[PDB]
Design a binder for this molecule. Structure first.
Ligand code: CA
Ligand code: CA
Ligand code: NA
Length: 202
């Protein structure tokens, strides 16, 4: 009544595993003909018990599969589950959420005043989905919490009556770029501008 080495099988592959690639090898005994049910993404070779992908997978669509595998020869069936888990691979860029950002700010607003919060999103997992945010070029007027996106003013004040054009530019435009922390790291297509409309206290 032909049965497998184990009743239940646990396997891990990577979301970029190729079309056709071997997932797992199964042998049952007490000849023997094998069949696999539970996703069309997977097929099992009927003589040899080799499970393979039929297609490309994607953990962001489906991270875990359960397949059911049957061995038959007065024939008798035997059943084992196979429990495929896809390991995340860093294959999505972050995407800016509500960019660009248009804001109105009172000049000489004091140290540590709220300005905005930039937000991006990454559908990958763990380090690959973790977002880190940076102001370029180095902006002396604004400080940004690299993990949370929140932007605040600095101990340097915002003075509209400042004659350096570049410092005025810095005051009135903030450019954030965002990465994620997998290897390779991936950045959002483009940076994201906060546009700042400076207002006196008339
Ligand atoms: Ca992924
Ligand atoms: Ca990513
Ligand atoms: Na993907």
């Amino acid at each position: 009544p032909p049965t497998f080495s184990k009743p239940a099988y646990f396997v891990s592959v990577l979301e970029n595993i190729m079309a056709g690639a071997t997932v797992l090898f199964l042998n049952a005994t007490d000849s023997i003909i094998y069949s696999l049910e539970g996703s069309s993404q997977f097929r099992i070779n009927a003589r040899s018990g080799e499970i393979t992908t039929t297609s490309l997978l994607d953990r962001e669509t489906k991270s875990e599969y359960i397949l059911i595998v049957r061995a038959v020869d007065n024939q008798k069936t035997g059943i084992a589950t196979v429990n495929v888990t896809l390991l995340d691979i860093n294959d999505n860029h972050p995407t800016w959420k509500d960019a660009p950002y248009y804001i109105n700010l009172v000049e000489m607003t004091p140290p540590d005043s709220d300005v905005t919060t930039v937000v991006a999103v990454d559908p990958d997992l763990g380090e690959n989905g973790t977002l880190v945010y940076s102001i370029h070029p180095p902006n002396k007027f604004y400080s940004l919490n690299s993990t949370t996106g929140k932007i605040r003013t600095t101990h340097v004040m915002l003075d509209r009556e400042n004659p350096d054009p570049v410092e005025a530019e810095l005051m009135r435009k903030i450019i954030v770029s965002v990465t994620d922390c997998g290897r390779p790291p991936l950045k959002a297509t483009s940076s994201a501008t906060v546009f700042v409309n400076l207002l006196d206290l008339n």
